[PDB]
Write a protein that binds this ligand. Structure first.
Ligand SMILES: CCCCCCCCCCCCCC(=O)SCCNC(=O)CCNC(=O)[C@@H](O)C(C)(C)COP(=O)(O)O
Ligand code: SF4
Ligand code: SF4
Ligand code: FES
Lengths: 118, 684, 47, 93, 208, 83, 112
């Protein structure tokens, strides 16, 4: 098994305490486009983001707070997480169901699908 | 049955009646669209989905035109490109130059589709139109000059929301969408018209001007406002929750969330518990370190044992915290772990999971033909469940009958009455609806958990079980018995062996009460000994915090990775979006630290170890997004037959009767000012 | 500017100031937004 | 305006509280506060009257203003307000 | 298409590069895996990682391929592959006035033969590839850090390496020296989600 | 001394058929005999069935039920119920 | 898979021992040349500590790569390419001790 953890140079705190999530990003509900929901992505766990005293900017001590790796398939992401010794959490991809849509149902004769306005 | 069509020459097998747009989606082509939505009726008026069919002289509308066998769809042909460019030009001819000031900017379908399929300049040398804004409520900010008359909001209201208030007035270039009169679009699902609308015509008033989409960080989590367990996306920016958006889950909430789920995030920024508080010699709560408060609670735990120590689980508590508190109170040999929602303990009780679960599942509603609602208001207790019921009735002709107060469910039902004696009539076959239940090939009976809060809850449960058993005997593995919860923590507590109700605490008054975020006020200081020690562990100080001796600041559902089980027994895990404010910590961490200080150290130190402990108590709390099949209904019915209570003559009145009683239910909702504005608007 | 005067605006300073770094009139940065999360005020009445 | 501590308040309402250590940065120095609150300056502008039902404001100067927007003037109870400029317009009534 | 906005396409160079790619593939079938010619007239030859020295030496010495100048030598990190590191060789032929590309692959452990014997320029390029990505080049005269700090740990140009790193420097008055401490940022790098949800180029659509 | 009883059985696993039959037949009798003792029936997935018994002061013991029979489950529970 | 320098862990362990001898015999020079304010034992213990961190490694390819990086670190120390700041970075001094106890972590912050 690949154990490249000793070669990546990551400190121990960010190898064992981390919790990598492997998922396909959900579609932005504000848009009908689905081009972003095609590649598997890998992100770490959110950590403390305190307020900088001088300016109020959101400070952080998490070096891995902006890492978003994109993978073609779930298996590749799982393998990459196993390579670096990161506790991965895979979420199964959710694909919208095929839906039976009929424009003629808008004017049904004995059904509730009859619309009152167009 | 599969006919064969071609998308850009490539063969694809599609079902008869499939539209051109779905045929193109099968191969991976997403035809541009404004009016078409998967969950709304086909309109065909935006005309953006026009595509060229080979050998055909006219461009069809992919959103409406059904495919015919042998058709070759030329998605990227020159006719399609020119049609898309012309339609985009017509759409942008009268559109206002509000992009810098439009909140849809950066996440606007019209912008992206203009960039991808439209032209790069304008030939419109005339003056654009202007539309007077219409006020439709305190939530949806309306700038109607940006409307492209795609009629998504109208169809969504009329079908998913049942509110036939939105519509088009006038004709031609002067057609205007919105209510003709100055009326407020009041609905529990009104917030979704902000999402369906492609342009920034309808925008979230609380979210107005606060942030841009490209900078927000998206954290996928689970809603805890109701028991539906809707999947949501917490959009954070620089460590602050900016908005909440729905996340697609076909089996739970499809694409929608309730108004409370969408707009109650602002409650997380008010009246928060940030630092531990202990009571001084003046009887007033004063700030203190974790050391002092934990030492006090540990000493009080070491002093009393047995029934003298009790704990009341709240409404928004997580499974990990529940199991941690259970183990901690078992270390002092105390089984007084009580929830705030009363479930009938007599009989099978919280031993068989299917006894207290929506066994038919939310997605199962689309399969039923007859549904009986017993003493509940699903429009407010579980808005997404009510929406699913409405969808089933609209597309499957699902006969719905309600036993209770005649509330408006946004769909027509059969109001059998409001007396529990009708349950006996149905069970004994006297009521005509019993014959209808016999006729139904996949009947479904749903009992609201709010009805079980009555003193005769056990009798009501027994009557519903009798009806279900009569259906089972008289008429595959279709579950009939169902209980619709209203609390995000009830199911997990029942799975973790928590006693369903404060009856045990009333029976046995404790001296150490551990209020774990319990703001319901079921047990007060007057119902306890005059020297009871109360520790409140929560995020908002609403009710329990004032009547407590030590305050331990907890975390909210957006500030911790936590397991919540919805009304159908599907365990789901939230993800951390922001960190708890001030000195607040994760609940199970607080419990474990308290246990370590009190000597009785719990056998877990990390989240994974706590979830391993959850599996030891119940393995179903670690299998996320999995509705495990368990029927065990015959045993439950037989055990309920043992104790025969009496149905009271009181009518079945659900706690929520109007939209006013829906916005403010829990601590987060009550702390929210948006919910206060909504309540004021719907009352006045 | 004597020949072509600058356009007169009411918001334009009527007294130009040199670089005031190192003087008491220097610029000190600070946050301009209000406090985000409001803490809970405990009741003043005993139990 | 002035906060109770004696510290001038900005147009955003920000003012360090008396129980805030961050106010010490202003001890031997000043607090930079703009004295031209825009919200007060626009409300000072009069409401223009135009007989037409729809007008267009570019902020003045043409290309030196903002994107051109068209404002409806049908509501007699309120005045059409430019999204960028903030200028108000009213149809004579 | 045509007209000023579009970029003119030269078919002659495309044909010549395709012919030369076929030529190279025929001469070296043991290592050449794939040959491509991009629409903007750039030739790429894909070579099995054992073919670094043979193919490069052929492209340097062959009378019909005098790529005597090593234009560039870089690596591309694609963490979605078994061999994430993709080593790219850019060559220049002053005799025929053309350029060619050679692409191989390697893991985080499998070494690559050093092309110093072929091109003397490959020395520092391979040192930089090792420093930035972690790829080890066997039979290299002197492989060590070239761009990172002397006591630096980790290979930064990897896709999984954080942008801000893990450690930061400052001067401490107690120890009278510059000291490395875990990185803490006054303001966090605001990650932007910019990709549009709509497909931009239909010609690159991957199969479902 | 006993406080609660937890029985974990997988839905379709052949090694839990005995536990499934026991729950189908004798669970009602067990609950009738012991009214106030929670027999928590949860479900496993592709793992050996187990019987958990929590005693006083948070002391829990587990007994494997893999490839058992309803008679053996009854015997084990009787041993747990009494001693 | 093709090896880097050794085909067996025993062969890989041989190179580790060779590196340790070079590191062990270099520490007295490192303290002398860099004018460190530590003892020879501290440096030699530090070398042992850094070697013991990579003691769980079992893949010979990773072992070879660690030795390759180990030789590179030694060359910088021998050639005085490193400075006193670089050498003393192993001895974390300005870093405050971070407790590993749960209750200590609970008191400090939200660190998991
Ligand atoms: C002045 C202070 C200077 C400190 C710098 C010291 C260094 O350079 S440490 C670099 C050396 N690292 C290694 O040798 C890695 C060895 N890799 C391994 O797998 C070994 O631990 C072995 C092969 C398991 C043998 O080790 P064990 O005997 O099992 O244990
Ligand atoms: S709706 Fe979209 S295109 Fe129209 S102004 Fe707003 S951002 Fe621009
Ligand atoms: S308001 Fe929005 S959703 Fe409604 S018709 Fe206009 S563009 Fe469509
Ligand atoms: S998407 Fe088909 S006409 Fe609008």
């Amino acid at each position: 098994k690949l154990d490249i953890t000793t070669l990546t140079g990551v400190p121990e705190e960010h190898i064992k305490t981390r919790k990598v999530r492997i998922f396909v990003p959900a579609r932005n509900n504000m848009q009908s486009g689905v081009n972003n929901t095609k590649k598997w992505k890998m992100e770490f766990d959110t950590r403390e983001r305190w307020e900088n005293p001088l300016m109020g900017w959101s400070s952080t001590a998490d070096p891995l707070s902006n890492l978003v790796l994109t993978f073609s398939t779930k298996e590749d992401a799982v393998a990459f997480a196993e390579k670096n010794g990161w506790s991965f959490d895979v979420e199964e991809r959710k694909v919208p169901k095929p839906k039976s849509k009929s424009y003629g149902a808008n004017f049904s004769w004995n059904k509730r699908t009859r619309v009152s306005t167009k | 049955n599969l006919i064969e069509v071609f998308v850009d020459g490539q063969s694809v097998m599609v079902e008869p009646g499939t539209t051109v747009l779905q045929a193109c989606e099968k191969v991976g082509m997403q035809i541009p669209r404004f009016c078409y939505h998967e969950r709304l009726s086909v309109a065909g008026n935006c005309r953006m989905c026009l595509v060229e069919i080979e050998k055909a002289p006219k461009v069809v509308a992919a959103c409406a035109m059904p495919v015919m066998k042998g058709w070759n769809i030329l998605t990227n042909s020159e006719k399609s490109k020119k049609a898309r460019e012309g339609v985009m030009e017509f759409l942008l001819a009268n559109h206002p130059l509000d992009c810098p000031i439009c909140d849809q900017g950066g996440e606007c379908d019209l912008q992206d589709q203009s960039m991808m399929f439209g032209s790069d300049r304008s030939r419109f040398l005339e003056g654009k139109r202007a539309v007077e804004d219409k006020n439709i409520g305190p939530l949806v900010k309306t700038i109607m000059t940006r409307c492209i008359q795609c009629t998504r909001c109208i169809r969504f209201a009329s079908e998913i929301a049942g509110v036939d208030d939105l519509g088009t007035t006038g004709r031609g270039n002067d057609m205007q969408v919105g209510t003709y009169i100055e009326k407020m679009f009041m609905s529990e699902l009104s917030g979704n018209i902000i999402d369906i609308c492609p342009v920034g015509a309808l925008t979230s008033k609380p979210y107005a001007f606060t942030a841009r989409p490209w900078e927000t960080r998206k954290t996928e989590s689970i809603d805890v406002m109701d028991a539906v367990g809707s999947n949501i996306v917490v959009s954070t920016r620089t460590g602050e929750v900016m908005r909440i958006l729905p996340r697609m889950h076909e089996d739970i909430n499809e694409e929608w969330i309730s108004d409370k789920t969408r707009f109650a995030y602002d409650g997380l920024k008010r009246q928060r518990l940030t630092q531990p508080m202990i009571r001084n010699e003046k009887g007033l709560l004063t700030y203190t370190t974790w050391e002092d408060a934990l030492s006090r609670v540990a000493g009080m735990l070491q002093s009393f044992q047995g029934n003298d120590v009790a704990a009341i689980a709240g409404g928004l508590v997580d499974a990990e915290a529940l199991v941690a508190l259970k183990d901690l109170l078992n270390r002092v040999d105390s089984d007084s772990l009580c929830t705030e929602e009363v479930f009938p303990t007599a009989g099978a009780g919280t031993d068989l999971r299917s006894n207290y679960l929506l066994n038919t599942t939310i997605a199962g509603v689309e399969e039923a033909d007859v549904i009986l609602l017993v003493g509940t208001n699903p429009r407010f207790e579980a808005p997404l469940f009510n929406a699913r019921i409405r969808k089933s009735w609209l597309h499957n002709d699902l006969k719905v009958a309600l036993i209770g107060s005649p509330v408006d469910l946004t769909y027509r039902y059969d109001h059998l009455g409001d007396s529990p004696k009708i349950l006996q009539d149905i069970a004994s076959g006297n009521h005509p609806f019993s014959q209808i239940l016999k006729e139904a090939k996949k009947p479904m009976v749903v009992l609201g958990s709010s009805a079980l809060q009555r003193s005769d809850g056990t009798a009501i449960l027994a009557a519903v079980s009798n009806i279900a058993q009569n259906i089972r005997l008289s008429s595959g593995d279709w579950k009939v018995m169902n209980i619709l919860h209203r609390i995000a923590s009830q199911v997990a507590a029942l799975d973790l062996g928590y006693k369903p109700g404060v009856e045990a605490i009333r029976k046995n008054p404790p001296k150490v009460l551990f209020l774990l975020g319990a703001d319901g006020g079921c047990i007060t200081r007057q119902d306890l000994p005059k020297d009871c020690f109360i520790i409140y562990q929560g995020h908002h100080g609403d009710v329990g915090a004032p009547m407590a001796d030590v305050i331990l600041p907890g975390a909210a559902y957006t500030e911790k990775s936590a397991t919540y089980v919805n009304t159908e027994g599907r365990a789901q895990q939230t993800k951390v979006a922001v960190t708890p404010p001030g000195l607040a910590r994760e609940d199970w961490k607080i419990i474990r630290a308290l246990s370590e200080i009190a000597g009785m150290t719990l056998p877990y130190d990390t989240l994974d170890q706590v979830r391993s402990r959850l599996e030891e108590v119940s393995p179903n709390l670690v299998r996320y997004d999995d509705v495990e099949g368990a029927n065990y209904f015959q045993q439950a019915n037989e055990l309920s037959k043992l104790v025969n209570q009496q149905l009271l003559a009181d009518p079945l009145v659900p706690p929520q009767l109007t939209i006013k009683d829906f916005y403010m239910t829990d601590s987060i909702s009550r702390a929210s000012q948006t919910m206060a504005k909504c309540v004021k608007a719907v009352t006045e | 500017p004597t020949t072509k005067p600058p356009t007169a605006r009411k918001y334009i300073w009527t007294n130009h100031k040199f670089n005031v770094s190192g003087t008491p009139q220097q610029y000190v940065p600070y946050s301009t937004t209000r406090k985000k999360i409001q803490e809970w005020v405990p009741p003043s009445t005993p139990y | 305006r002035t906060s109770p501590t004696g510290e001038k308040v900005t147009h955003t309402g920000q003012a360090y509280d008396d129980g805030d250590y961050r106010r010490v940065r202003f001890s031997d120095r000043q607090k930079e506060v703009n004295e031209n609150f825009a919200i007060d300056l626009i409300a000072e502008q009069p409401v223009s009257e135009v007989g037409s039902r729809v007008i267009s404001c570019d902020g003045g100067g043409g290309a030196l203003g903002h994107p051109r927007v068209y404002i409806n003037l049908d509501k007699e109870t309120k005045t059409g307000t430019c999204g960028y400029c903030g200028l108000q317009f009213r149809q004579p009534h | 298409d045509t007209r000023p906005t579009i970029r003119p396409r030269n078919d002659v160079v495309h044909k010549q590069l395709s012919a030369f790619g076929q030529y190279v593939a025929e001469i070296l079938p043991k290592y050449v895996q794939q040959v491509q010619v991009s629409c903007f007239n750039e030739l790429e030859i894909f070579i099995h990682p054992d073919g670094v020295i043979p193919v490069l030496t052929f492209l340097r010495d062959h009378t019909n391929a005098q790529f005597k100048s090593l234009a560039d030598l870089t690596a591309v990190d694609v963490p979605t592959r078994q061999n994430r590191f993709e080593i790219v060789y850019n060559l220049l032929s002053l005799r025929f006035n053309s350029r060619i590309r050679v692409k191989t692959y390697t893991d985080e452990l499998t070494p690559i033969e050093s092309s110093v014997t072929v091109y003397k320029a490959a020395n520092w390029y391979e040192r930089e590839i090792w420093d930035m990505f972690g790829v080890f080049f066997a039979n290299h005269p002197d492989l060590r850090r070239i761009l990172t700090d002397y006591g630096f740990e980790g290979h930064p140009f990897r896709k999984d390496f954080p942008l801000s790193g893990y450690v930061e420097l400052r001067y401490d008055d107690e120890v009278k020296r510059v000291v490395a401490e875990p990185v803490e940022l006054a303001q966090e790098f605001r990650k932007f989600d910019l990709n549009s949800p709509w497909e931009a180029f239909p010609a690159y659509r991957q199969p479902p | 001394g006993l406080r609660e009883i937890r029985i974990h059985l997988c839905q379709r696993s052949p090694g839990s058929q005995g536990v499934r039959d026991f729950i189908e037949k004798r669970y009602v009798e067990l609950k009738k005999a012991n009214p106030d003792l929670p027999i928590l029936i949860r479900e496993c997935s592709d793992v050996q069935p187990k019987l958990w018994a929590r005693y006083a002061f948070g002391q829990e013991k587990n007994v494997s039920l893999n490839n058992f029979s309803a008679d053996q489950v009854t015997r084990t529970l009787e041993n747990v119920l009494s001693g | 898979v093709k090896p880097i320098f050794s085909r067996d862990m025993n062969e890989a362990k041989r190179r580790v021992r060779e590196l340790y001898r070079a590191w062990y015999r270099e520490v007295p020079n490192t303290v002398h040349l860099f004018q460190l304010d530590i003892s020879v034992k501290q440096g030699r213990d530090k070398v042992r500590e850094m070697f013991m961190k990579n003691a769980h490694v079992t893949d010979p390819r990773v072992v070879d790569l660690l030795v390759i990086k180990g030789k590179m670190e030694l060359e910088e120390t021998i050639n005085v390419w490193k400075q006193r700041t670089h050498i003393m970075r192993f001895f974390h001094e300005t870093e405050a001790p971070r407790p590993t106890d749960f209750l200590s972590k609970f008191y400090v912050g939200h660190d998991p």
